[model samples]
Target chain A: SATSLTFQLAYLVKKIDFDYTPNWGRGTPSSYIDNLTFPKVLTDKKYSYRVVVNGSDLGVESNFAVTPSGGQTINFLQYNKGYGVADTKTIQVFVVIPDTGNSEEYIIAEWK
Target chain B: SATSLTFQLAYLVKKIDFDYTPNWGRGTPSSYIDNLTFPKVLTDKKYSYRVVVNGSDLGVESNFAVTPSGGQTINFLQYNKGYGVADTKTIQVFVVIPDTGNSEEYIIAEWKKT
Candidate 1:
């Protein structure tokens, strides 16, 4: 399957951790892909989003919204808000999971 | 507006932490509801499930699935798998997030309702 999808405007990954030990790269359990996309670089139609998962220095928050089939595993912690009146617009995705020896970095912001 | 839901078949809560510190739990934020229910249990006809929020020793994982309105601030930590051809079945819910520093949990599975 020759996949093609390119759009932009969904950034904010200050933190991220759903590390059930899946598979991606570098150290492992790191999926925070929202450098934002969708600007006619290509096309796919069906994009609504909402993401809020925060724990900066241990607090606790879990927001949800998803409408992605953009590719891969379809969805999981991806969040959605597509199709008619959504994106009430709230973003804060932080997941810093390192004990103290410290070696974790994932961030997203806009909760003020 | 009397919520009437009573049936059961949902179990398992190992690890969870959306620890964005939103609400619930003892000190703050705690929502893990699945003692399983719905045995002809009321008829809402919308229930399929999936949950995997593992970070026990800190391996991290976030699965999602939603289709709720069962009541109140829904769709977060409340997953879904309704409709058809689901329940692909996968369970390993473990969220021991204290950062070794102590206390945090929130979990859900499947994926999303996109």
Candidate 2:
């Protein structure tokens, strides 16, 4: 049934150019493009980024797309900070399922 | 000694009763307590919960509290949902750090964030 959906997890763990042009936006940063080419804008190289897409139903809880028509896409953005020491920093992302009634928190990603 | 702070990762990976009284708030659920006994309240068991505390200075990026007092306590509340199956369910938690211009998304705990 369409009601029974699954939450899939996807992420990128790599070194992004600190001086990456535009910091973020619907264009070529090359790094984000190399990762998965998600069509959305981000904050900056200094901040962490995450997004949520639908997944397969593993018989568990799948409360992602609540629309009857389905075909819904959600975007999430997390905290920010200066890459303390190195330019190419480790960007840990958490794109989790949002609470019912509120869709903002789906931005919190879960571990795979 | 102060500026070199670190992000400590603490979490509860257990089964929380869906009917957990108050759904969220201080006191005893016996679970959050058995886990760590955090002093704040949560939204509800239906939604996943996570919070971040400072960690050891591993010499990496320790961008938690920006206050000079260094007593900054951050709270985070993420997405929520009904425990689709089983009374006692698995609550996934991911407390991440936020982006630069904003102290909010810190609500979006990191894997530990940037």
Candidate 3:
């Protein structure tokens, strides 16, 4: 025998992905970027998140921040090796549900 | 003058409480532990978390791991000082919303001087 059951709850159950491409190979340089910013809205709910910066020419992959709870913006400073170098900057940021401490990928944003 | 209105959204939004009593001073010891684990279920939605270990005889608080958008378990190793020494370990782990880079406190569990 089978039955149809449903449950209801209330809260802002959401996650978002954000990423940007650095045109270091194209015509982008340290001077080429003034600063890029994005707007994100968070509620008074429980949440956690992290930000990662990746780029071959952009330098090594770096972790911007790790917040155990609440919301915040992802910020990165420019570190250009000069103008004649090619780099791939993939900024990755993800938010997670910390009910369980598992290594799962929250691909809200991904860049090579 | 003011107005009163209510809006609604859907999804399971929850946080839980967990902690234990370490009788280190009275009768607890390194052998007093076997490993501690908790039961938690998560949906395909978004969530983040952290874990903290606190105790006068415990030692220090530490971070187990940080998941950007999933679930996992918090694990820690034991370090006991023989059978007649005094130590304090305050292990603390917290989860954040990542939308803001503000230092906030989410006290899910706490234990010290008790």
DockQ of each: 0.01, 0.01, 0.02
Model 1 — TM-score against the truth?
0.14
**Could you arrange the candidates by lDDT from highest to lowest?**
3, 1, 2
**lDDT of model number 3:** 0.31
lDDT of each: 0.23, 0.22, 0.31
After superposition, the stretches of candidate 2 with alpha carbons farther than 4 Å from their true spots are A1-26, A32-87, A100-112, B1-114
Worst 10 residues of 3 chain A by lDDT: A1-10
TM-score of candidate 1 chain B vs. the reference: 0.18
For model 3, the DockQ equals 0.02
Q: Work out the TM-score per prediction.
A: 0.14, 0.14, 0.23
Estimate, for each residue in A1-112, the C-alpha lDDT of model 2 and write its tens digit.
1001101010111111111111222213333311211122122212223432233211212222323321222222111121111123332223222332322222222322
- Global lDDT of model 1: 0.23
**Candidate 3 lDDT by residue in tens digits, B1-114:** 000000111111112111222222222464323222323323332333343444233433334333443323433343334332223545343333334442332433222333
lDDT of 2 by residue, B1-114 (tens): 100010010011111111111122222332321121112222221222243234321121222232332122222211112111121333222322224322222121222212
Which candidate has the highest lDDT of all? Answer: 3
